[PDB]
Design a protein around this nucleic acid. Structure first.
Ligand SMILES: [Mg+2]
Ligand SMILES: [Mg+2]
Ligand SMILES: [Mg+2]
Ligand SMILES: [Mg+2]
Ligand SMILES: [Mg+2]
Ligand SMILES: [Mg+2]
Ligand SMILES: [Mg+2]
Ligand SMILES: [Mg+2]
Ligand SMILES: [Mg+2]
Ligand SMILES: [Mg+2]
Length: 319
RNA sequence: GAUUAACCCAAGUCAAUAGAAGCCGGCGUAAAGAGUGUUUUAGAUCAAAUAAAGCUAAAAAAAUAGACUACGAAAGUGGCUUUAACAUAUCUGAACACACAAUAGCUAAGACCCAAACUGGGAUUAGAUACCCCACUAUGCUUAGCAACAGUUAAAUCAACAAAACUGCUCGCCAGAACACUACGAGCCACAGCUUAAAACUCAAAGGACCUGGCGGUGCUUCAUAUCCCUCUAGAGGAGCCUGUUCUGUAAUCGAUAAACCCCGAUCAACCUCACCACCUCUUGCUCAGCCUAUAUACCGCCAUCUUAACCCUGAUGAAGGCUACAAAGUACGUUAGGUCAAGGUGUAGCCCAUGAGGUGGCAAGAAAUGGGCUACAUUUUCUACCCCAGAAAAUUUAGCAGUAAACUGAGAGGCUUAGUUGAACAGGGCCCUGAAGCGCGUCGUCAAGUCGUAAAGUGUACUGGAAAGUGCACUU
């Protein structure tokens, strides 16, 4: 399968009409070899349906097409790259389906046929997502898709679709952080009670043609058959955010803020005691089972008190 | 590895192992010396502070003085008054004694004007501003808790680099990488994660200071900037023939005349003749015949192409370096599948029932777009007399630069060489490129190495869920 040569940075500057190399405001991975590595780590893609986000110049696109995919849905925001992607599509007829639009609003649930939809408890449904997006867009995207897994909608109408996304090295570590680690944070819990998350490898900044001052991690997500917390996404998000707002103080200092001041002291204690959270646990020392306990007790407290779930302590400190 | 020869020791040789064999050397940068004061058994010779009360002026914390450099052990202290008040008559000596001081990180409560990591909300490109605006947390606040000392500048000062080297006297510290790596395990946790280590082991290094450089490099700056530009000046497209290329067409050549014609120049086809096409004939014949058929892709010739050290000083006699003019170390021929067989040769090959000699017919093209050439092209003209006061007729390109362009005459060897006459127009800006110097920059990556690809700013720490890095707090130049 012969494909067009990859565009060098010269052609890319000419294409974006910048006429210089220090005005891109973007970093491109123009190394087909690292992209081969990433597509290898994404799994066995033979006759797979790949939803590739943030195509850009097309190193990831070329790497994926080199693997024997069936359909490769591309979603590009910029129109200066559609010409190159159209040349790629013509070089490999029938495999590249290009679309123009934002990945944060694009509806993947209708993109692929309904004959690929496997049940949730069965194997991942032969539909993969691969992404090298701006880090300013991959974090909202992963939050949105985590909500989708919690609701079993969106890209996960086909089942437990696997994701391979590039994040910043720190963000990737935090996504794949263990209990007690110095990178354990909100993002770790939020990703980990819904997915098996693996930080596979780190690409140094020197490998990107405009070299960034950061490293880039590649992280693989596989939705879990049995989520570790069976509560609504927004409730878990609220609990985790209030726990982790004070990362270096005891866990109760952050949990007291879920309740109005009037009943802060007694309600916080009731929460902790109907859970079994030792109040000397600092937030990085809480496993997903501690958060499951807190979420269950908090769901109860909300269900016998309607006003609670909408409470925001800063809206009460304003007055 | 074998073999030859050599070397050492020798009734031994020498592989392994183990001993013998070593601190009066150093601690800014290589391993090793500061938070401050007091005391301490011994050893040595060197016998504008601080705390209290009160009080305040401009706008709680203190402009001017302060260009001052004082007080205090250090951290620190600079609004006014008053009261207390600023140890000690030799030095060294604390992990363990007493006082202070600062730096992290958490824990309890408390205040909250203001600011503010995180967290929400609003506005913005066409991955918006990461950056603007609003609100409000942690936090910033307040408590209580977790090398010394004395003398020297004499010497060769002087591994270098810092910060000129020194002695004496005392304490502490230092004897490769290695403040290496590693979780047998332990604690917390409670099946899967976090925190916590020395030693072995391995190696011949590790470490410190300095120097040369090299980029077959990168851009720009100014001017000399002549050729080349650009401007500017003066002429050069229509018509008729002849040539170049293309397409179309034929069996074929609208091809040539030391070989026709013409007898003004030239010329087209000529029934010349050679050349081409289609048919035939001749044969030992011309004369041991006949062809200009090839070759300089044979040489020669003629043109053209390309290539063509020493000495003396400086750095402590280290790598290393050496300039000032009102002068401070510098001086001494080949090459070519080249063209030319027309003003010229010396050879070599070819066919010899044909590459020779004849005969019968045909052949005589068409069409465009463009390239080139030759003629006539006038009123500032043409004809006569005269040699200048008469009468009759009717777009690219080439040069420029001066006796040049343009126009007009003569002489030659027989398209080329020389001698004359008349005689213009324009004449301003900038470059390529060498010349003359100056500044800066600059000193690539990756999957298994290429049979790989390509040309205000910082340092920490904390949080970060719109993180290709941002913000907050404290510091540095
Ligand atoms: Mg023996
Ligand atoms: Mg040291
Ligand atoms: Mg003392
Ligand atoms: Mg505020
Ligand atoms: Mg001492
Ligand atoms: Mg003819
Ligand atoms: Mg003949
Ligand atoms: Mg020749
Ligand atoms: Mg942020
Ligand atoms: Mg910072």
């Amino acid at each position: 399968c012969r494909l067009p040569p990859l565009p060098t940075i010269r052609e890319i500057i000419k294409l974006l009409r910048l006429q210089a190399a220090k005005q891109l405001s973007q970093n491109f991975l123009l190394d087909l070899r690292l992209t081969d590595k990433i597509v290898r780590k994404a799994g066995n893609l033979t006759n797979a349906y790949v939803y590739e986000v943030g195509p850009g110049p097309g190193g990831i696109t070329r790497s994926i097409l080199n693997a024997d995919v069936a359909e490769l849905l591309v979603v590009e925001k910029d129109t200066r790259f559609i010409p190159g992607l159209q040349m790629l599509s013509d070089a490999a007829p029938g495999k590249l389906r290009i679309v123009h639009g934002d990945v944060l609003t694009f509806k993947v649930e209708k993109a692929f046929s309904e004959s690929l939809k496997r049940p949730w408890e069965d194997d991942p449904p032969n539909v993969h997502i691969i992404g090298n997006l701006p880090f300013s867009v991959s974090t909202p995207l992963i939050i949105k898709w985590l909500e989708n897994i919690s609701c079993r909608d969106g890209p996960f109408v086909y089942g437990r679709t696997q994701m391979t996304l590039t994040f910043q090295k720190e963000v990737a570590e935090r996504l794949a952080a263990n209990t007690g680690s110095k990178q354990r944070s909100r993002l770790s819990v939020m990703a980990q009670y819904l997915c098996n998350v693996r930080h596979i490898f780190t690409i140094p900044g020197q490998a990107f043609v405009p070299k960034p001052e950061v490293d880039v991690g590649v992280v693989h997500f596989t939705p879990l058959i049995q989520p570790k917390i069976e509560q609504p996404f927004k409730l878990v998000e609220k609990v985790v955010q209030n726990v982790f707002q004070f990362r270096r103080k005891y866990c109760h200092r952050g949990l007291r803020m879920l309740f109005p001041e009037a009943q802060r002291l007694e309600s916080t204690g009731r929460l902790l005691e109907l859970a079994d959270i030792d109040p000397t646990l600092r937030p990085r020392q809480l496993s997903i089972s501690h958060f499951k306990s807190l979420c269950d007790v908090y769901r109860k407290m909300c269900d016998e008190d309607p006003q609670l779930f909408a409470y925001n302590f800063r809206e009460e400190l304003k007055r």
